[PDB]
Homo-oligomer: A and B are copies of this chain.
C-alpha cells in the first residue's frame, strides 16, 4: 500500500549524547528481526542500510554544546538520505541513534513534504537551545533547531549551518512529557506548543489524548505525520535500556495505542525509533525487553493491530 511502504535507514550515531552507546541501536533493532518482521504484513520494506558517518577527529565543543560538528554533519547526512527515501514515496523509518539525529530526520523529511506535522513521543521536551541548555548535549536540543519560532535564539553552532528550521510551533505535539527543565518549559509555554504531558494523559486517557492530537494536527488539513518516537517515552519497566529513563511514563499499551492510531490515519510519513541503548541494560533481559518493545512499537506503526490482521483472502477455504 502507499502506507507501510517502508524505507529503513540505519543511523548508528551516538555523539549527540553524553558518553554514549546508543550507536548500536540499529544493530540490535535489526538483529532482533525488524525487517524480517515487517515483511509478514504487506510492507514493501527497502533497507537503505546503516548510514556511513564519516569521522570528525578534531571536534571541540562550541560553548557548552559537546561535539557539535559531528552531530551537525551526521544529521545533514541523515537528512539527505531521508529526502532520498521520501522521493521514492516511502516512509523514512530512521531507526537510531539518538534525538540528535531528529534534526536530520525531520529536516530531510521536510525538504520533500514541507507541511509535515511532528508527533514527538518523548519523556523529555528535547527543546533546549544551545544557550539555555545545561548539560550541553545535543540529544536534548533537536527541536530547537527545527522550530521557526526560535530563529535568533539559536546561535550559529558549527556544523548546523545547513539547518533551516522547518516546523512551526503549531505543527508539533508532545506526548508523554514528564521530565522538563525550566528552560524547556519556558520555551514550551511561550511558543504555545501543544503538549500532552503525563498529567494530561492521566486526565484524558490515551484514547482522548490521541483523538485530540490527531484532531489538532490533521484537523485543519490532512498532512504527513512524522512520529518521532523515543523509547524513554515509555515507562522504564518496558524500556529500561535507554539513556535517561524517567519513571511513571507511558505504558506498553499506551505506546501501542499511540502508534496504532497514528497508523490508522494512513498519513504516517516518517518514523524515528531513537535512544535504544543496549549498553545500559543491567541484565541482557532488560536489553531484550527494550528492543522487543521498540520493535513492537515500530510494527504497530505499520499496520500490526492488536485485534489481529488478515490478508484480503477467504480464510474459510
Chain A residues at the B interface, C-beta cutoff of 8 Å: 125, 129, 131-132, 153, 177-190, 195, 197-207, 247-249, 251-254, 256-257, 260, 296, 305-311, 314-316
* 16 contacts across the A-B interface (CB closer than 8 A): A179-B308, A180-B308, A182-B308, A183-B315, A183-B316, A184-B308, A186-B315, A187-B316, A188-B308, A198-B256, A199-B256, A199-B260, A200-B307, A202-B257, A204-B207, A248-B252
Q: Which residues of B contact A306 (CB under 8 A)?
A: 177-178, 180, 197-199, 248
The contact of A131 among B132, B180, B316, by CB within 8 Å, is B316
Q: Which residues of B contact A204 (CB under 8 A)?
A: 207
What is the chain B residue whose CB lies nearest that of A181? Answer: B308
Q: Which residues of B contact A179 (CB under 8 A)?
A: 308
Please list the 10 inter-chain residue pairs (A to B) with the smallest Cβ-Cβ separation, ordered nearest first. Answer: A180-B308, A185-B308, A203-B207, A197-B307, A182-B310, A186-B315, A202-B257, A248-B252, A186-B310, A183-B315
What is the chain B residue whose CB lies nearest that of A150? Answer: B316
Q: Which residues of B contact A199 (CB under 8 A)?
A: 256-257, 260, 305-307
What is the chain B residue whose CB lies nearest that of A206? Answer: B202
The contact of A257 among B180, B195, B203, B249, by CB within 8 Å, is B203
Interface centre among A179, A314, A316 (most CB of B within 10 A): A316
What is the chain B residue whose CB lies nearest that of A246? Answer: B306
Q: Which residues of B contact A260 (CB under 8 A)?
A: 199
Q: Which residues of B contact A308 (CB under 8 A)?
A: 125, 177, 179-182, 184-185, 188, 197
Q: Which residues of B contact A311 (CB under 8 A)?
A: 182
Q: How far is the CA of A310 from the CA of B190 in the complex (A)?
A: 11
What is the chain B residue whose CB lies nearest that of A211? Answer: B203
Q: Which residues of B contact A132 (CB under 8 A)?
A: 315-316
B248 in contact with A256 (CB, 8 Å): yes
Min CB distance A259 to B, Å, is 10
Q: Which residues of B contact A252 (CB under 8 A)?
A: 247-248
Q: Which residues of B contact A131 (CB under 8 A)?
A: 316
The contact of A180 among B178, B183, B307, by CB within 8 Å, is B307
A316 and B185 contact, Cβ closer than 8 Å, known pairs A177-B308, A207-B202, A257-B202: no
A307 and B207 contact, Cβ closer than 8 Å, known pairs A248-B252, A248-B256, A316-B132: no
Q: How far is the CA of A310 from the CA of B308 in the complex (A)?
A: 43
Q: Which residues of B contact A254 (CB under 8 A)?
A: 202
Q: Which residues of B contact A186 (CB under 8 A)?
A: 310, 314-316
Min CB distance A114 to B, Å, is 26
Min CB distance A317 to B, Å, is 8
Q: How far is the CA of A257 from the CA of B178 in the complex (A)?
A: 12
Q: How far is the CA of A300 from the CA of B131 in the complex (A)?
A: 28
B125 in contact with A185 (CB, 8 Å): no
Q: Which residues of B contact A129 (CB under 8 A)?
A: 316
